[PDB]
Amino acid sequence: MIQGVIQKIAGPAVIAKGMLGARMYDICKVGEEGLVGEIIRLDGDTAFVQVYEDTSGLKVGEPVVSTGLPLAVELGPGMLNGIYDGIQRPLERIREKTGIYITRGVVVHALDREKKWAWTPMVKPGDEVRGGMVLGTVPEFGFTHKILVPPDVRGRVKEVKPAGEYTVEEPVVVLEDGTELKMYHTWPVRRARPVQRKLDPNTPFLTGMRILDVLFPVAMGGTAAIPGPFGSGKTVTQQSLAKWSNADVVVYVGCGERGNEMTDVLVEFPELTDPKTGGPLMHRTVLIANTSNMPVAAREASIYVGVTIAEYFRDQGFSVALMADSTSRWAEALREISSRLEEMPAEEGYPPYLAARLAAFYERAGKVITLGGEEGAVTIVGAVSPPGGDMSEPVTQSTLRIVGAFWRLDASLAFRRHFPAINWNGSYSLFTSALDPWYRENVAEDYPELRDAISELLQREAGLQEIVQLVGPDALQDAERLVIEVGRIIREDFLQQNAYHEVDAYCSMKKAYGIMKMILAFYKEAEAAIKRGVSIDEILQLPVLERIGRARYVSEEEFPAYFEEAMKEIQGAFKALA
Amino acid sequence: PVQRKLDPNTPFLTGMRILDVLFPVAMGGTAAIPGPFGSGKTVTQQSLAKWSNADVVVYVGCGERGNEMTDVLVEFPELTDPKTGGPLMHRTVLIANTSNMPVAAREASIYVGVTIAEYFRDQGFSVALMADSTSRWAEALREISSRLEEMPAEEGYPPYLAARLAAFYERAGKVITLGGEEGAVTIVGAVSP
Amino acid sequence: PVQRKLDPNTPFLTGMRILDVLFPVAMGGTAAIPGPFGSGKTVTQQSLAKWSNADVVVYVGCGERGNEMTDVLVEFPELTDPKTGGPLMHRTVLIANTSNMPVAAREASIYVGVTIAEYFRDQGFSVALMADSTSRWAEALREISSRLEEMPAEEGYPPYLAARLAAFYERAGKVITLGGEEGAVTIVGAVSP
Amino acid sequence: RRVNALEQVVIPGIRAQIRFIQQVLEQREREDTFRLKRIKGKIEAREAEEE
Amino acid sequence: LLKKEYTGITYISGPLLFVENAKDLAYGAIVDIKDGTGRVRGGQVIEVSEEYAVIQVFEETTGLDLATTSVSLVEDVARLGVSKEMLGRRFNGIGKPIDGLPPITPEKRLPITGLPLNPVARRKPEQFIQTGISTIDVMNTLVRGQKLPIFSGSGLPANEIAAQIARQATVRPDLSGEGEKEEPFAVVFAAMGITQRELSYFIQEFERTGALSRSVLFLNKADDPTIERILTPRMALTVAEYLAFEHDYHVLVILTDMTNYCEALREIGAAREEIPGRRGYPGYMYTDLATIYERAGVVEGKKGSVTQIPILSMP
Amino acid sequence: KKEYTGITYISGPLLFVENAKDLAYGAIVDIKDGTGRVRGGQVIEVSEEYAVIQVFEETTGLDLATTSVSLVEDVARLGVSKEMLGRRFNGIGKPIDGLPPITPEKRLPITGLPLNPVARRKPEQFIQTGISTIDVMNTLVRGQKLPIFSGSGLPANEIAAQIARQATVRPDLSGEGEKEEPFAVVFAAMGITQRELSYFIQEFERTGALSRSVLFLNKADDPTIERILTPRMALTVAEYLAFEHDYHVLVILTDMTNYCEALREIGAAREEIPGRRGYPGYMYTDLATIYERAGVVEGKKGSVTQIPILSMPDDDRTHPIPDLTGYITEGQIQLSRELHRKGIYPPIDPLPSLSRLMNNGVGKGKTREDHKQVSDQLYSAYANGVDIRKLVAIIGEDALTENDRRYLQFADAFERFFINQGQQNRSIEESLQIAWALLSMLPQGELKRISKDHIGKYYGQKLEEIWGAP
Amino acid sequence: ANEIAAQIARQATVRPDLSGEGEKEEPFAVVFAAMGITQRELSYFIQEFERTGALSRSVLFLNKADDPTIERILTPRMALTVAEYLAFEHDYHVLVILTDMTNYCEALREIGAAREEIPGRRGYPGYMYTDLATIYERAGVVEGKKGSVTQIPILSMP
Numbered sequence A: 001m002i003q004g005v006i007q008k009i010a011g012p013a014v015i016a017k018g019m020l021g022a023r024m025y026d027i028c029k030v031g032e033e034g035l036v037g038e039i040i041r042l043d044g045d046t047a048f049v050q051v052y053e054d055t056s057g058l059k060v061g062e063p064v065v066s067t068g069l070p071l072a073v074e075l076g077p078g079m080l081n082g083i084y085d086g087i088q089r090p091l092e093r094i095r096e097k098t099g100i101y102i103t104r105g106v107v108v109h110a111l112d113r114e115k116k117w118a119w120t121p122m123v124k125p126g127d128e129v130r131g132g133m134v135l136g137t138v139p140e141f142g143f144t145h146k147i148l149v150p151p152d153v154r155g156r157v158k159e160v161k162p163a164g165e166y167t168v169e170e171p172v173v174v175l176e177d178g179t180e181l182k183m184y185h186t187w188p189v190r191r192a193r194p195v196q197r198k199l200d201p202n203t204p205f206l207t208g209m210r211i212l213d214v215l216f217p218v219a220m221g222g223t224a225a226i227p228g229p230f231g232s233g234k235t236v237t238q239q240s241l242a243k244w245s246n247a248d249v250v251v252y253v254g255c256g257e258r259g260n261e262m263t264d265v266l267v268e269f270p271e272l273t274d275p276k277t278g279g280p281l282m283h284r285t286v287l288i289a290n291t292s293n294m295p296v297a298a299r300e301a302s303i304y305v306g307v308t309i310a311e312y313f314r315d316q317g318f319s320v321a322l323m324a325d326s327t328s329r330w331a332e333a334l335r336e337i338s339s340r341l342e343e344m345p346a347e348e349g350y351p352p353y354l355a356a357r358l359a360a361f362y363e364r365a366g367k368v369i370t371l372g373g374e375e376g377a378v379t380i381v382g383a384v385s386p387p388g389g390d391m392s393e394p395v396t397q398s399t400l401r402i403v404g405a406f407w408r409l410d411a412s413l414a415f416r417r418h419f420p421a422i423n424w425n426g427s428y429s430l431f432t433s434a435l436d437p438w439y440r441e442n443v444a445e446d447y448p449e450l451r452d453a454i455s456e457l458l459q460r461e462a463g464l465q466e467i468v469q470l471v472g473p474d475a476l477q478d479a480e481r482l483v484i485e486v487g488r489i490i491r492e493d494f495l496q497q498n499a500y501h502e503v504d505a506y507c508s509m510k511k512a513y514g515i516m517k518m519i520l521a522f523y524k525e526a527e528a529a530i531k532r533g534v535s536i537d538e539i540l541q542l543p544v545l546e547r548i549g550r551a552r553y554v555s556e557e558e559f560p561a562y563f564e565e566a567m568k569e570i571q572g573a574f575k576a577l578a
Numbered sequence B, C: 001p002v003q004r005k006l007d008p009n010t011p012f013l014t015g016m017r018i019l020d021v022l023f024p025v026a027m028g029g030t031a032a033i034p035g036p037f038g039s040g041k042t043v044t045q046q047s048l049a050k051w052s053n054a055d056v057v058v059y060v061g062c063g064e065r066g067n068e069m070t071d072v073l074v075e076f077p078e079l080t081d082p083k084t085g086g087p088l089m090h091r092t093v094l095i096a097n098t099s100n101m102p103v104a105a106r107e108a109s110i111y112v113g114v115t116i117a118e119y120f121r122d123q124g125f126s127v128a129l130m131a132d133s134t135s136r137w138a139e140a141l142r143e144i145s146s147r148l149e150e151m152p153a154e155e156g157y158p159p160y161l162a163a164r165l166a167a168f169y170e171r172a173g174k175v176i177t178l179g180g181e182e183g184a185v186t187i188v189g190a191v192s193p
Numbered sequence D: 001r002r003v004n005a006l007e008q009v010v011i012p013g014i015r016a017q018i019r020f021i022q023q024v025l026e027q028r029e030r031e032d033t034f035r036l037k038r039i040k041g042k043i044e045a046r047e048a049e050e051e
Numbered sequence E: 001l002l003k004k005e006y007t008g009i010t011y012i013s014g015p016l017l018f019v020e021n022a023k024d025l026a027y028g029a030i031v032d033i034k035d036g037t038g039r040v041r042g043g044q045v046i047e048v049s050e051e052y053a054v055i056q057v058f059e060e061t062t063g064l065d066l067a068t069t070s071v072s073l074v075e076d077v078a079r080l081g082v083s084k085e086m087l088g089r090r091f092n093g094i095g096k097p098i099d100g101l102p103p104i105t106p107e108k109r110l111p112i113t114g115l116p117l118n119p120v121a122r123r124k125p126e127q128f129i130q131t132g133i134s135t136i137d138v139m140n141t142l143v144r145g146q147k148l149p150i151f152s153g154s155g156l157p158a159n160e161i162a163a164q165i166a167r168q169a170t171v172r173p174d175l176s177g178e179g180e181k182e183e184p185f186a187v188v189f190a191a192m193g194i195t196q197r198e199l200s201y202f203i204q205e206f207e208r209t210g211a212l213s214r215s216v217l218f219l220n221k222a223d224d225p226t227i228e229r230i231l232t233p234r235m236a237l238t239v240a241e242y243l244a245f246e247h248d249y250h251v252l253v254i255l256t257d258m259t260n261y262c263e264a265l266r267e268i269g270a271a272r273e274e275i276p277g278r279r280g281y282p283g284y285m286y287t288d289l290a291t292i293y294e295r296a297g298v299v300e301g302k303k304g305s306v307t308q309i310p311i312l313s314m315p
Numbered sequence F: 001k002k003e004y005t006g007i008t009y010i011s012g013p014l015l016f017v018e019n020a021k022d023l024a025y026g027a028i029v030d031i032k033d034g035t036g037r038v039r040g041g042q043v044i045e046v047s048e049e050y051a052v053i054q055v056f057e058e059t060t061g062l063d064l065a066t067t068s069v070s071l072v073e074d075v076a077r078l079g080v081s082k083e084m085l086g087r088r089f090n091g092i093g094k095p096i097d098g099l100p101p102i103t104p105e106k107r108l109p110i111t112g113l114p115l116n117p118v119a120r121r122k123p124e125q126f127i128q129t130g131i132s133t134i135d136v137m138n139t140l141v142r143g144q145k146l147p148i149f150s151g152s153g154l155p156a157n158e159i160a161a162q163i164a165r166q167a168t169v170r171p172d173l174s175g176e177g178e179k180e181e182p183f184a185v186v187f188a189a190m191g192i193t194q195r196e197l198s199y200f201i202q203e204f205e206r207t208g209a210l211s212r213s214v215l216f217l218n219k220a221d222d223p224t225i226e227r228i229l230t231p232r233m234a235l236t237v238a239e240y241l242a243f244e245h246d247y248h249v250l251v252i253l254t255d256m257t258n259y260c261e262a263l264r265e266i267g268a269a270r271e272e273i274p275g276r277r278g279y280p281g282y283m284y285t286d287l288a289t290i291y292e293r294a295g296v297v298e299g300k301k302g303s304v305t306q307i308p309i310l311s312m313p314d315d316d317r318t319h320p321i322p323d324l325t326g327y328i329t330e331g332q333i334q335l336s337r338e339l340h341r342k343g344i345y346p347p348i349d350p351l352p353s354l355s356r357l358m359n360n361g362v363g364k365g366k367t368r369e370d371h372k373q374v375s376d377q378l379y380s381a382y383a384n385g386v387d388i389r390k391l392v393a394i395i396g397e398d399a400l401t402e403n404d405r406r407y408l409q410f411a412d413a414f415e416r417f418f419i420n421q422g423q424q425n426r427s428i429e430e431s432l433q434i435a436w437a438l439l440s441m442l443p444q445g446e447l448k449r450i451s452k453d454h455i456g457k458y459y460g461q462k463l464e465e466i467w468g469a470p
Numbered sequence G: 001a002n003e004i005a006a007q008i009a010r011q012a013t014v015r016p017d018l019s020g021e022g023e024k025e026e027p028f029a030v031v032f033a034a035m036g037i038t039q040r041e042l043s044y045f046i047q048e049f050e051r052t053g054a055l056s057r058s059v060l061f062l063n064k065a066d067d068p069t070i071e072r073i074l075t076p077r078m079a080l081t082v083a084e085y086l087a088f089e090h091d092y093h094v095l096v097i098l099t100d101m102t103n104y105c106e107a108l109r110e111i112g113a114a115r116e117e118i119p120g121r122r123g124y125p126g127y128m129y130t131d132l133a134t135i136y137e138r139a140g141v142v143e144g145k146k147g148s149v150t151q152i153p154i155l156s157m158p
């Protein structure tokens, strides 16, 4: 490998001479302490290396060693139930050998090199292997981890190890060429993993949250952005998606958050339970954790590591959900890195290539046919935090241009303690037109038209606000008081959900369809009674209001009996009325 | 060179009511017509070319569309000169440098046009000069100065832009020629902020 | 050098109602009076020089008009010292460096004025120091920094401007002198944004 | 009448003025950055005239 | 023909690299860059001099080193091989097929930058196009040879309007008595910075209409190299000009979301430390945009025509 | 020992010395001239041919013939000991109180290692600051970073001195009573003048609060590199005490705007291209390395709490220093100029102020069980009264209903009694008593945010306890 | 502005009767400095001075719009040198009119940008205050001398 010596030290910038043959953007180890850095410029015999960590104490003449590879992650068994930083350093193993502080120059491995795994071969000698096929399986918690050949490797199998206990470092398959395949391989974080073909979105990503995946659904493999201010629910919704979605593996990325907020996430997450099996939620999630005082390079590269791990788990045939918390803090690190490189700014101080990076990050999602012949998907949900609620900042326009859904939060509904606090007037979704051939085959034939009727009822209430803000609410006509009351019923009994309840935390499509049918059955009969001619106050007092309200807290397996009872009850009550 | 410069005392009849009544321009004066896109600068300058009472009209299309030059080349041979009964194109000189033509030639076209207008002034004629856009000339100066690695003054323009603009507009006026005749040149320049 | 600094507990009377009542300044305190041209900085400072109860007044004309210094030279010998009854000019020292004087002498005038004001402090007097414009000092520093080809600050000023400004203002205060007596220096500086 | 006049006229003009001033200040800052880059380049070029 | 290689690389930084002894590289030429691993990159010469030649790389410079990198010349001017068989095919903006079919056989190789049309050779556009929209056909009518862009917002359906105009376009020869025949119609569709969800809509609309048999598609995706976005409209316009002025087709060129083109141009300009314009954009955008729009029109003595409908979203 | 005499260039704050490749980057050096005076300096760039040194103080007497440079230490270190309680330092570790220097137990680098995110634990205990508007509505939790936003003429220094004088912990309210825990205060003053220096010196010594405090004081005329180094030394002492002797420490940083400007001129002097509005591009990371040194650690009984103080330049909350501080901190307390001009001290305005970790430090098992609902009710009632007060000026008092007049009187009495405490040292129980006395002026049943259980227990007391002596 | 300046130069007089002196004065001598002036304004000024008969008492320094730009650096200095010489050596009362200082500032900015000076606001050189001060402060009165210099500069606000 290429080895040189330091020639000039000035802040984080180091000039090393004797480095002829080193390649651009390689990872180098600087000094006797082993500080890591990247080569950013080549000039003759010298190379410019930008050191990640603190450089105080370095001297001229200390060795510089090039690893010869760009920034990459180790992909293999042992990533689940793990906590990593932005450059895939296991924090738990760092804590054991160092204490409460992170000393500079510590060396650890992403995958444990001494843990034994249960090997089970699938290929036999004489077989031809191409990139993406399965060599064998290894059990890991509730899953079976498939051992994949790297995508750039092809050849014929020479020898296969028998079944037994092995570590990740021992070769299991060796080809006729002489290349030895281990249980793990490395891949650059900035290069997308190849696939065969990208399929269309035609299956919904069930979030379990009534408003989110009834009014503004997101398809499997889609993208969504959820901006909002403090106390608006951003975090509970995310962790609720982690708890209740139909994704097999969850990847959580935190880019440069506050320390006391990463503390909450790191402490609370091991205490949650997986609703599928009752085991810990940690057994199917990977967290990337970065605070504000970590090096800016790790904060900038945090999301690429997460999306690469999500792509690796997608390549095994799973369905992966990726949650990127506060991409604005990633854009801040990008701005800082661009400022240190002396590049020209654009708009609000951001580098001109911000939109290109955001487009390159969001484009990795989608449902694909993997190289192994199996389907997989990655779904990305990215949180945004505007500086003052103005969606005119550059990051929000750059996000709005590419995302397929937009869940706008509002603190005004949080002030009224109405959760989820989602502004249904400013939100939108572009996956509704391609999802209803799934809805009217697996939910109910009348589901789409019922959804549009409910949306129309919600819209008609909003068009009467300039009446109520001038004239008192009680003075209105019967035909308008009726729609105001049905709007209140929708806002309080359908668009409201409790995540801490035993049964209300998760809602299925049949239950939501039943509730919507129940509400429309109430509304049509109240309207017909209005032309029949009755006191409006008597309608607002009828006992079927309790049947409307108490439909939320009924259990999933006992809902249909309640639905049929309420269906007969509303008719019986409105026939009893004069 | 000229012998003397005289004070203008006769109007330049453009054929438009608002310009000829409310804001007149003299037979040796200068005028500027700034405006946003789709406001009327080109239609106003072609109407002046069609209907004014000047003897010779010089049209300088510094960095504009190529279809307008085709319109001038097609329509004008069929129209009638207001003051001599001949075809309108017989009194017109066109200097065309479109937007996709080389950038550095935008500067030369303005000087060529004003030099031809000065030449026809020395024969005792009354000449009207129209510049389709001077902002393109300013952009050409900016590009050349950027290639020279000079320090920009404001908005990226070179610091000597005002001197060039003043030198261009100063060539107009009513004069007594070296041959004893009397001639005048009017300059109407459009600006595209 | 001095023996010990003391807290401020005696007001510096200026003779203006709004400054004496609403926004007081103590005997060893500092104050700044910024404003655009034509707002009243010079008239206020000259009124302070006329009517204040300081024993000795030191006036620094750093980079301003010469007629303002001529007015002080002409009218002060005819006025009356409020607390002694003699001529007013007998208690005043003027340092004059007008606008068309050489640029590099503007900093020297400020330092000379503050050094003289500290010298009169050591004899047990209370001295008031007026700086007519501290912005011209910054402009002179910027002009020299241009000739030094060094890296400038936010608006072209040298980076060490704030250190100089802090070192100039912290020379004021009420002290116990090396001889055991008590003196005070108060600084009022104008800013011309 | 006053409520409608304020809401539909007065606020958008102030917002447009703010949006214009912000762009002007940002452009001036960008020009300053370019000039600082040029002077740093000249400073680094000066030291190599006679090594 | 022989090939020549240069190995005197002396400086790599960002998108630029310097070659020492390359005195015989023409200005604006296309070079072919190879590293030690065999991966091949492209680039263009942006400045040539006696001491060195400056080459910018079309994509990222990861993996290059001064010891093993070599630069090879391809051609003195960027050219595209065009043919009449390009109809019904799909390309990735740089010119390579992405439909899985074998590549074409070029009849001619034309420079992609084009040449200005002589104003004497032009003629007036006078043929009215009926689009089927009252607000267009009556008050903003479209003529063969016109360049008429659509100013759109973020969530507004500009693409549906463009597709509807492409479907319903007709010339109505009966109002002037100009016979009954149709001189053949063609559509050239160029997409810069488009997303898969949107591109699928255009693909499905073209398949449903059946207009794919007479259309050429140039597709540049959001994860493609940023330079390939710059070259995308020029090749589409080259193909349209070739068809219209050598085979008498009436082509219709649709350029989608030129805001992506302008941001890509800003990136490329700011990568070379140049004096910026009004909002950080390069100060020479007017010429660069004029070299794209001005290629449409009608030519005296020829039957073909080029009509442009660019689409851009107002920020 | 060894001296370098190859000086080749002097200009302003920088000097070049040849053949000095043995000097490590960031080392501290001593500069000696012909008159025998010794100045300090820091190495900012090392190369094969020469090294660049930034000089403390001024360079008046230097010349290229007789100047020499000698090494002091390769890494800036500070000697720490428990003797430091009751001492004053000049910002680089030199005592200025006249007492002999301390003997160090250890010498630690002033730049600190980051905390491992898996080693922290959630803050769960509060600090009694003695101010009702902070204790009741914006409670400060052990391990929180709660800055104070002030203007130019607002009395931030007096509030800082009062908080440092009155701060204490309450172990009797926690659990069964627990046990006594040590407490200490670390005060860092940066860019202060002589008047504020004398004020702080008199205030800390006139009441006996010096015996539990460490003071780092940096004047306005001191070198700017000392102003850079001061908060790191303060945090080093705080971390040493808290995580090696189980102290509960409180760090007060007097003015971070001075720190940000000093960082600006330091970056400008090192030929660095600035970022937004002339500020360095790495200001976010540099500020994060200071704020994120506070917190509480699993397995440790000590903690560090920070109260940064900063002055908004032109009252612009979008300025970079207030903007980036809100991205790292956990709320803010905003002083109001109108309340200050009305004569109310301290001028803490409860409407824009917020504490984000408040809910973790309140509730049964600590303080009192009715804290959160009382705070919410006070916030809502004050918000109503404020706009009723503006409506009165147009429509007149007689046009209001009875409830609007009661809200107006509640707002007046609230501003008169709750906020305007003067120099009183109020416990949490007294503040809650006054809060319930103010809520008693509102009629029962309009207190929507409070449950009937607490209303039936605390409602009804008259204001006479504080009304008889405001 | 030019009409107002011409009217002031035409109508200006002192009132010794109000001050009690009883003297009869003599008319002002005029020094006229034109920088980048156009023919339209120059002809107006010439005709006005011809009609008022003030050309026999006037000294004219003309730098037209088509003249070279860098000559504008010198013109105010020579005009003020002549004015100072007349006023303080021959006891004249001199009135000085400078047509456009904006053109002078552009001429100064050209040289400042050519020399890579550190700019102030809007690209103007940092020493423009001193350079403008060396022109303006040459007016006033001198103790023990009868002459005087009065300045009426004219400038256009962009």
Ligand SMILES: Nc1ncnc2c1ncn2[C@@H]1O[C@H](COP(=O)(O)OP(=O)(O)O)[C@@H](O)[C@H]1O
Pocket: A229, A230, A231, A232, A233, A234, A235, A236, A237, A414, A419, A420, A497, A498, A499, A500
């Ligand atoms: N489904 C829900 N049920 C009850 N409360 C909710 C729900 N969703 C959000 N909230 C409330 O929203 C608030 C915001 O919490 P969180 O998301 O953790 O922080 P932030 O939104 O400020 O990032 C919480 O106090 C929580 O009580």
Ligand SMILES: Nc1ncnc2c1ncn2[C@@H]1O[C@H](COP(=O)(O)OP(=O)(O)O)[C@@H](O)[C@H]1O
Pocket: B035, B036, B037, B038, B039, B040, B041, B042, B043, B044
């Ligand atoms: N006097 C006029 N009468 C009718 N239409 C006009 C007139 N002036 C301008 N227009 C309209 O303005 C449009 C284009 O204006 P144009 O001259 O191109 O302005 P610019 O050159 O600034 O873009 C033309 O389509 C024309 O219909």
Ligand SMILES: Nc1ncnc2c1ncn2[C@@H]1O[C@H](COP(=O)(O)OP(=O)(O)O)[C@@H](O)[C@H]1O
Pocket: C036, C037, C038, C039, C040, C041, C042, C043, C044
């Ligand atoms: N206290 C005052 N009383 C009366 N007139 C004043 C007062 N202060 C200022 N002025 C007027 O305002 C003008 C301000 O001039 P001056 O203070 O010399 O300029 P600047 O404030 O720009 O230095 C003076 O001409 C004076 O007539």
Ligand SMILES: [Mg+2]
Pocket: A234, A235
């Ligand atoms: Mg959150």
Ligand SMILES: [Mg+2]
Pocket: B041, B042, B064
């Ligand atoms: Mg035009």
Ligand SMILES: [Mg+2]
Pocket: C041, C042, C064
């Ligand atoms: Mg003044």
